[PDB]
Amino acid sequence: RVQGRWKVRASFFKEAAAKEAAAKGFAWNVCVYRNGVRVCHRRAN
Structure with a gap:
């Protein structure tokens, strides 16, 4: 099967x-699951 989640x-x-x-x-925004909570921080750009 082909996954579209990241596709x-x-x-x-x-569109970029x-x-x-x-x-x-x-x-x-770097969104990760930090101790269960979806946390996001800004990339250095």
Whole structure:
């Protein structure tokens, strides 16, 4: 089977030409499950 969970990241690689807002402060949040809680911090960009 092919998983689409991450495949959507490859799909939006084409839509990543609109990255004008994604140049700084769009999807640069590092979200991880820290002790059960989904925590996000900003990448150094």
